[PDB]
Structure formats: C-alpha cells, structure tokens
Ligand binder design. Structure first.
Ligand SMILES: CC(C)(COP(=O)(O)OP(=O)(O)OC[C@H]1O[C@@H](n2cnc3c(N)ncnc32)[C@H](O)[C@@H]1OP(=O)(O)O)[C@@H](O)C(=O)NCCC(=O)NCCS
Ligand SMILES: [Zn+2]
Ligand SMILES: [Zn+2]
Ligand SMILES: [Zn+2]
Ligand SMILES: [Zn+2]
Length: 532
C-alpha cells in the first residue's frame, strides 16, 4: 500500500499534549463523574464477568493520558477517537438509567464543550464522533475528507465538500487564504434551479411578508418547482365496472402533478425546509374532477430561522399556492389533513429526533387557521369540511365525489363493493377539507421532468441510500447540498434556447443581466447584455 502527500501537517508529541490535554484535564476535574473512568474497568472488583465479551476495546482516561504523555498519538483525531471509545463503551454496557451511564453523558457534554474549540485552532472542524441513524447491530459513520494540502482529516459534512461541485479536490479554509484564493462558487444553488411563475409567486409573496415582520436572523427564501408532469389516475376496478362500464364517469382522469420545495439561506448556505406535492385537475378533465387541485403531501423540517416566523411562512406558501391556481382558473381545492402514520416521513428522510409529529386535531386546527387567514385575505372566499359541502350540494351517487390519486376515497369505495358508506364519510369529516375559490385553464410554466421528484418515493429511497438525513441543522445543510446537485445535474430536461424577439433557434445569444429569462439575437433591446 503506497502512500504520499508532501506538505503534511504532522504534530509532534508535546505540541499535541500542549493543545489536547487541557481537555483531558477538564474530564478529570469532574468529580465524582470522572472516578469510574480514571482507571481501566476491572470486572473482578465490579462483579461483571460479561464485560470483555461486551466491550471489546476498553479505554479509560489513564490509558489516554499515557498515550498522550508517551506520544502514541500522531494526529489529534486518534486522541478524540479514543475518548469517544471510552464514552461509547460506557453508554453501551450500562443501562440508560444506571449512574455511570449518567456520569458518562456529563463527561461527554463537558468534552464536546471543550474539544471543539481546540480542534478548531488545530485546524479541524469539530471534536465529535458522528454516526448516521440506525437503518432497517451496527451503525454507519459520517464521511471524512482530507485537505489536499494539509492532509488534515475533516468531516465532510462539517465542511460541506462535494467533489461534483469542486472537482479539483478539497482544500481547507486556512490553506485557502494561505493560497490567497477564496473557494470557488457553488453553482448548484437553490436560487439557480430553473425558475417558474408558480415558484416565483410563492417566493415573491413570502419574502416581503418576512420583510414586513423584519426579524434580523431571517434569510432569503427560494421557492422552486422541481418537477412537473402529466399523469392520469385510473378508476379502481370495482367502482369502474360499476360506473364507466355504465358510462357515467370516465375511466381515467388527467392531472398535472408538481413537486415544489422551499429553501432558506442559513449561515450562507441553502437549507431545504419545506416540500409539497400537488395534483392539479384541469378544465378538460371530466366530472367529477373538473377544475380542482389537491394537496397530496406536505412535509417540513423545523430549522427555519426564526422559529417564530416559521409557521407563518408555511401558511404564506399554501395560501399563495391557492391564490396562484385560482387566477389560472381553478375553482375548488382539497386538503386531506392526515398526520403521519408510523414515523412515516412524508418527503424528507430523517426528521429531527425532537420535532414532534402532531396529533390530527393539531393538524386540522393548523390547516383551519391556515384557511382563515386566506379568507380574511380575500383569497379563498369560503371553505367547509366534506359533509357541510357534500350534503349541502345534495350528492347521492359515488360518482359525485372527486376521485384523486392515492386519495382515501377511491379505496374506501374500492373495497366497499363486496360489502353503510355515507357513514364511513361521517366519521372522518374533520380530516378532509373542501376549499371554495370562487375560460380554459392553461399553465404558463413548462414541464420539468425530474424522476427523483416524480412522486415522493424516489427522493426518500435515494436519501436512505445516501444518508441525506434532515435530522440536524448540519446534516440538513449537507443533505440540501446534495439534493441540489441531484436536481441540477441529473434532471431529465435538455434545454433548447430561443431568441425572445424573433423566436428563432439560438446558439450564440445575448443574455440579459436584468430579466429572469431573456435572450436576444445578434441580429438585434434596452439592457446591458452579455454573450452566452
Ligand atoms: C404540518 C407541519 C408542516 C406544520 O408544522 P408547524 O407549523 O411547526 O406546527 P406543528 O403542528 O408541528 O406544531 C406547532 C407547535 O406544537 C408543538 N407540537 C407539535 N406536535 C405536537 C404534539 N403531537 N404534541 C405536543 N406538541 C406538539 C410543537 O412543538 C410546536 O410548538 P412549540 O414551538 O411551542 O414547541 C408539520 O407538522 C410537519 O412537518 N408535519 C410532517 C407530517 C405531517 O404532519 N404532514 C401533514 C400533511 S397533511
Ligand atoms: Zn467536524
Ligand atoms: Zn488545508
Ligand atoms: Zn433585459
Ligand atoms: Zn433575432
């Protein structure tokens, strides 16, 4: 196994100890919590013959101090890997309630507190030992990268490096201004996703909502429609043999589905904090589904800054969505406000351990004050739950109720043919909403084919495989980084560009610095234009 890197950062024993040991000391100073840790665990004093079958690499403060004093640590990470072995062996063996389990956790908050600054002035990211959350005995570790010039290993996720964005390799931040060089731009930003009129309207609406509230920690929001697709929902076999064999409802029903996410700039980087999937049923779609939209799935990560503005802006996206489709020509909208089943993640792969899933009535109340704000806003002009709507509209037939993809009702009907049914309605009135908004519908936005976002399953599976967890602010940033690379670079659309005055095909063109998608010929406008 041949190796090389020539201007390595190597640490000689006592420069390490001069930096590292103040941290060991802070552990030792913790009294009594330190005491079961100043010595190697001795199962014959303690009375635990199982120990060495359980913890197969014992570690303790004294061993660490010996390695430090004698110089057996070449790089600081070996140091910090060794104390976390100490902690991890304790949390393993001992019961979550035992005393030394508790001792241990206190040494660890102390060590976290002390280790990060020193590892940082030694030019590393943190002093932590990170493993991804358990999958379907053992856990996967966070990735590292090596500065091409230091050689000093850093958490990939900490320093947010990805070779696709910077193919020349990773180089650290201090060596970078040693280089006189700043880091090249991450072109694969939320802002730089193709923009759409739908995405713009939601984007434009909320950020000067935020402007009106004007809290200092808030950053820019970007709303992007990352997929758009023409599908049709087939009538499930029972109801179709009973109704379209008859000729009373159509076999298929066309709809356009859109997936659209919302990003905020946090610490200088895009964080994805909201995502949604709609089904839009146009004006050519036969009854019962003509001119209506349906909010399939809605999902969220709580790292929007500030949290007090957080919920309001979710509402601003939703209400802004209905505002948009209204004017296009839609007339009614439909929310199935059903809260998650089973730690079911709707769109984002590993939610924060401490962002709790709501009970259904929380979620209904939520959606209800959602709609009240828009009613007051003169956006929606009325809304009711499904029975004040259904029996107020006098419906007696199963053909009369909108029939959506993946929706509850197609499948309550579908198995109800062998076996009563207005009652199966009456139970669940509070979970389904009917939104009254009020000349063919035509969508200005082009179709975006993105297989990763066609339906919610592709993004989730890819995230499981790539460990793009949304479970911490630092992981969401990294998961957002790579989500954005997937959208930018493995979308399915090729672009043919055309001149905005003559409609002609173009290769060379003069790109406005001004308009969001504008490109004049050479056969030539008001604005400064560059050649693209
Ligand atoms: C719907 C959603 C986007 C709205 O998020 P939100 O605006 O942050 O509000 P929530 O309904 O989560 O809860 C708001 C408050 O209630 C608390 N809370 C939420 N669920 C709770 C529960 N079941 N029990 C107790 N408290 C709860 C939260 O802590 C928060 O209060 P706080 O800041 O004082 O701590 C969010 O619930 C979400 O991401 N859901 C994912 C799955 C889901 O519910 N999908 C529904 C699609 S129809
Ligand atoms: Zn780190
Ligand atoms: Zn470096
Ligand atoms: Zn212009
Ligand atoms: Zn021209």
């Amino acid at each position: 196994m041949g190796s090389s890197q020539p201007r390595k950062k190597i640490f000689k024993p006592e420069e390490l100890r001069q930096a590292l040991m103040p941290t060991l000391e802070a552990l030792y100073r913790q009294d009594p919590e330190s005491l079961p840790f100043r010595q190697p665990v001795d199962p014959q004093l303690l009375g635990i013959p199982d120990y060495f079958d359980i913890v197969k690499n014992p570690m303790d403060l004294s061993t660490i101090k010996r390695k430090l004093d004698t110089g057996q640590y070449q790089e600081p990470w070996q140091y910090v890997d060794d104390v976390w072995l100490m902690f991890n062996n304790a949390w393993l063996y001992n019961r979550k309630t035992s005393r030394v389990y508790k001792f241990c956790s206190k040494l660890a908050e102390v060590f976290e507190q002390e280790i990060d600054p020193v590892m940082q002035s030694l030019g590393y990211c943190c002093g932590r030992k990170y493993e991804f959350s358990p999958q379907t005995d053992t856990l996967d570790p966070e990735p590292f990268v090596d500065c091409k010039e230091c050689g000093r290993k850093m958490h990939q996720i900490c320093v947010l490096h990805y070779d696709i964005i910077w193919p020349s390799g990773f180089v650290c931040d201090n060596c970078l201004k040693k280089t006189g060089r700043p880091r090249k731009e991450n072109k694969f930003s939320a802002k730089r996703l193709q923009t759409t009129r739908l995405g713009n309207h939601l984007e434009d609406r909320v950020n000067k909502f935020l402007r009106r509230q004007n809290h200092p920690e808030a950053g820019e929001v970007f709303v992007r429609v990352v997929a758009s697709s023409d599908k049709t929902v087939e009538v499930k076999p029972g109801m179709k043999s009973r109704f379209v064999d008859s000729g009373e409802m159509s076999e298929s029903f066309p709809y356009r589905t859109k997936a659209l996410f919302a990003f905020e700039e946090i610490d200088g980087v895009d964080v994805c904090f909201f995502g949604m999937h709609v089904q839009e049923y146009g004006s050519d779609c036969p009854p019962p589904n003509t001119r209506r939209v349906y909010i399939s799935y809605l999902d969220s990560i709580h790292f929007f800054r500030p949290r007090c503005l957080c919920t309001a802006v979710y509402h601003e996206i939703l209400i802004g969505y209905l505002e948009y489709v209204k004017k296009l020509g839609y007339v009614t909208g439909h929310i199935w406000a059903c809260p998650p089943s089973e730690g079911d993640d709707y769109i984002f792969h590993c939610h924060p351990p401490d962002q709790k899933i709501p009970k259904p009535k929380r979620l209904q109340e939520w959606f209800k004050k959602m709609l009240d704000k828009a009613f007051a806003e003169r956006i929606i002009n009325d809304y009711k739950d499904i029975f004040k709507q259904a029996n107020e509209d006098r419906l007696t037939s199963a053909k009369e109720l909108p029939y959506f993809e993946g929706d509850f009702w197609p499948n309550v009907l579908e198995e109800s043919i062998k076996e009563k049914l207005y009652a199966t309605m009456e139970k669940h009135k509070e979970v389904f909403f009917v939104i009254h908004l009020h000349p063919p519908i035509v969508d200005p936005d082009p179709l975006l084919s993105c297989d990763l976002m066609d339906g919610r399953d592709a993004f989730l599976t890819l995230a499981r495989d790539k460990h793009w967890e949304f479970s911490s602010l630092r992981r969401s940033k990294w998961s957002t980084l790579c989500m954005l690379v997937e959208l930018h670079t493995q979308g399915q659309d090729r672009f043919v560009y055309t001149c905005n005055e003559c409609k002609h095909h173009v290769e060379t063109r003069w790109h406005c610095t001004v308009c969001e998608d504008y490109d004049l010929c050479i056969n030539c406008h008001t604005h400064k234009m560059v050649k693209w």
